[PDB]
Design a protein around this ligand. Structure first.
Ligand SMILES: CC(=O)N1C[C@@H](C)Oc2c(F)cccc21
Ligand SMILES: [Cl-]
Ligand SMILES: [Cl-]
Ligand SMILES: [Cl-]
Length: 163
């Protein structure tokens, strides 16, 4: 475990993370994809061997000894708000199981279903609250990665509100 488990947020490419493992915002078919998924494919392509997994699940594949946890959030274009909310919560619970199983002291994580799977809606708060619900019982240092300057401020505010 971390000596004083924390949450942090950084605005940069998650392919440049300084953590012991990464969470990919994966598609269900293990394809290179776009956004975070394409960055992850360029950095850790070996981790896409048999990485296909259903919506609401996570599947870990090692790139050398570096664990890539492929977490499949729902595409809100296809799911109802109700069913998508349930699957997005479930993907983060499976991430927390994997982080625990791996025994890592730190994990880099993007906000699932906030980009091309958002169905064109702002889901920062919805996705971050499901992240906290899953990760709060883990003792890994969590570092959240984002690309937008205003999202950085809002994620940082939400972290500091609870401390
Ligand atoms: C830049 C912004 O506000 N974002 C985050 C970005 C990754 O994607 C989005 C989206 F698909 C739908 C609504 C908002 C956003
Ligand atoms: Cl960067
Ligand atoms: Cl997405
Ligand atoms: Cl972002």
């Amino acid at each position: 475990g971390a000596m004083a488990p924390s949450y942090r947020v950084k605005r940069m490419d998650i392919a440049k993370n300084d953590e012991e493992c990464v969470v990919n915002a994966a598609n269900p078919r293990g394809l290179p994809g776009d956004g975070v998924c394409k960055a992850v494919y360029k950095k850790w392509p070996e981790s896409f061997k048999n990485s296909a997994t259903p919506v609401g699940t996570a599947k870990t594949v090692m790139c050398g000894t570096y664990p890539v946890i492929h977490a499949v959030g729902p595409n809100f274009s296809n799911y109802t708000e109700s069913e998508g909310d349930r699957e997005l919560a479930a993907a983060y619970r499976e991430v927390a199981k994997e982080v625990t199983r791996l025994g890592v002291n730190s994990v880099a994580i993007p906000l699932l279903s906030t980009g091309v799977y958002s169905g064109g809606k702002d889901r920062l708060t919805q996705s971050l609250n499901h992240l906290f619900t899953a990760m709060d019982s883990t003792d890994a240092d969590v570092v959240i990665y984002c690309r937008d300057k205003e999202w950085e401020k809002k994620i940082s505010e939400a972290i500091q509100m609870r401390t």
